[PDB]
Design an enzyme around this catalytic site. Structure first.
Site, PDB file in Angstrom:
ATOM      1  CE  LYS A 143      15.011  39.416  21.582  1.00  0.00           C
ATOM      2  NZ  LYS A 143      13.810  38.582  21.290  1.00  0.00           N
ATOM      3  CB  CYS A 147      -0.950  -0.010   1.203  1.00  0.00           C
ATOM      4  SG  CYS A 147      -0.159  -0.271   2.800  1.00  0.00           S
TER       5      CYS A 147
END
Ligand SMILES: *O[C@H]1[C@@H](O)[C@H](n2cnc3c(=O)[nH]c(N)nc32)O[C@@H]1COP(=O)(O)OP(=O)(O)OP(=O)(O)O
Lengths: 260, 216
Positions: free
Chosen positions: A255, A117
């Site tokens: 940051k 399959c």
């Protein structure tokens, strides 16, 4: 597009009951631009391997319900009979009619019978186990266990195992689906704690019991419905973002470039 | 227990195994493979006699276990067993094949092949084949360093090939495969295929010189 979870899938498993060779689907040269050389599974590879072992394949059973993967003539030109056996769709396991068709075909055919399959586990194993029970007088327990050991945990859909045991054994004794190996999900979409520094007392948690628990508690603390890291994600400022700084109170901070 | 082929009917020139010769010199019992459609199309190739199908479809059919009578007094068992006249069959010149045995010397010289001489005053003369005939060929080989054409029959020649040449197999288990030979023994000629590197040992007569690429 190539099917998902196919690149990491092993091409073939061990033969089952000395008769069946379970396979994932071959992909023809038409997919070479999507598949690196080391991962290619042309039909010629299968036939060349069998020739190298002086083994003949009498029949190849294709359970994919499609012809877009490879050319059947690549199989038939080698003297291998090719059959496209249509199976029940919608994710359901093969019907009793499908199993009877498979048995009627295979009982006509030492040489190996290839069965595939898309991935080579669920439909393939279902039909192989059905043949083992109905034709070779195996127990369903033995068939399921042997297919699990040949192509690793051969059937992993729970309803497939339940239906096999309902047809051939006791449904209340059907095993649960196996836990899947890590390679199954590597294509769906860090071990170093801090990059560049080595940090004492900090050791990564891979222990299966406590890992899920820490993740779970963080989810529940954040009210996070989906899977993954629950923390807040900031977005980069653009000319349409900055107008938000006028519309409510805001605080700023520098940051530093760091690891969240 | 010989083989014949029927003259008339739908079983014309079909291999029939002579089961029992009736000493009355009128008919003999013949084992045949039915060319019937089991009363389904008519209101055909050879296939096995399916008694269950003809019991299911009905019509002119009588069952005696494996013995059966059907469709114009055709007698079958397990395989037709029906009487047919000696003048309605040919009892001379059938010669069935191996596939018919499962159902119930030779010379092959080709132009361009290389052969040697194994006996006589012209021994060890290798030449290329020009023509071919049936039993006494009277071949005209182009030998090495000889502008004349000599004469050799089939029993004197042998398909000899130098080591390292295109070789094909004409018949046997190894037919259809090509490759190169390695060492030429007295009669065991070993070769390696174009597809695989397995040793294939063949008789000298089962080799031919063909320069085409293998199919695979
Ligand atoms: O051509 C395709 C496609 O047009 C049609 N199709 C698939 N899903 C839908 C849908 O939800 N709605 C409509 N109207 N049409 C749809 O099916 C054709 C191809 O059929 P498949 O064989 O590819 O279906 P498949 O096997 O992929 O389904 P499954 O076995 O993965 O569940």
């Amino acid at each position: 597009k190539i099917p998902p979870r196919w690149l990491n899938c092993p091409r073939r498993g061990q033969p089952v009951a000395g008769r069946f060779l379970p396979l994932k689907t071959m992909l023809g040269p038409r997919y070479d631009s999507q598949v690196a050389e080391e991962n290619r599974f042309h039909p010629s590879m299968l036939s060349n391997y069998l020739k190298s072992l002086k083994v003949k394949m009498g029949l190849l059973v294709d359970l994919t319900n499609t012809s877009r993967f490879y050319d059947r003539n690549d199989i038939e030109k080698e003297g291998i009979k090719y059959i496209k056996l249509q199976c029940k769709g919608h994710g359901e396991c093969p019907t009793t009619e499908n199993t009877e068709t498979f048995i009627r075909l295979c009982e006509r055919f030492p040489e190996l019978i290839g069965v595939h399959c898309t991935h080579g586990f669920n439909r393939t194993g279902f039909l192989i186990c059905a043949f083992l029970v109905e034709k070779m007088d195996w127990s369903i327990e033995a068939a399921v266990a042997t297919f699990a050991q040949a192509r690793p945990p051969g059937i992993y859909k729970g309803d497939y195992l339940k239906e096999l045991f309902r047809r051939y054994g006791d449904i209340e004794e059907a095993p649960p689906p196996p836990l899947l190996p890590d390679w199954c999900f590597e294509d769906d979409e860090g071990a170093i704690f801090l990059e560049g520094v080595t940090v004492k007392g900090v050791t990564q948690v891979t222990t299966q019991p406590k890992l899920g628990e820490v993740q779970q508690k963080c989810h529940q603390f954040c009210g996070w419905e989906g899977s993954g890291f629950p923390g807040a994600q900031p977005v980069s400022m653009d000319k349409q973002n900055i107008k938000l700084l006028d519309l409510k109170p805001y605080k700023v901070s520098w940051k530093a470039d760091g690891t969240r | 227990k010989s083989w014949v082929r029927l003259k008339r009917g739908i079983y014309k020139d079909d291999i029939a195994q002579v089961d029992y010769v009736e000493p009355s010199q009128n008919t003999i019992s013949l084992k045949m493979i039915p060319r019937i459609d089991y009363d389904r199309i008519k209101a055909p190739p050879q296939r096995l006699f399916d008694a269950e199908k003809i019991r299911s479809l009905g019509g002119d059919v009588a069952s005696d276990g494996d013995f059966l009578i059907f469709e114009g007094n055709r007698y079958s068992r397990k395989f037709l067993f029906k009487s047919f006249a000696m003048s309605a069959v040919i009892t001379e010149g059938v010669k069935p094949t191996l596939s018919e045995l499962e159902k119930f010397r030779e010379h092959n010289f080709q132009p361009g092949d290389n052969v040697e001489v194994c006996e006589g005053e012209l021994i060890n003369l290798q030449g290329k084949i020009l023509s071919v005939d049936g039993n006494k060929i009277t071949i005209m080989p182009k030998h090495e360093d000889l502008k004349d054409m000599l004469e050799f029959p089939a029993q004197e020649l042998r398909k000899y090939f130098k080591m390292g040449d295109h070789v094909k197999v004409i018949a046997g288990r190894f037919e259809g495969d090509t490759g190169l030979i390695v060492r030429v023994e007295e009669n065991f000629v070993i070769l390696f295929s174009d597809l695989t590197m397995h040793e294939l040992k063949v008789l000298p007569r089962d080799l031919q010189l063909c320069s085409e690429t293998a199919s695979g």
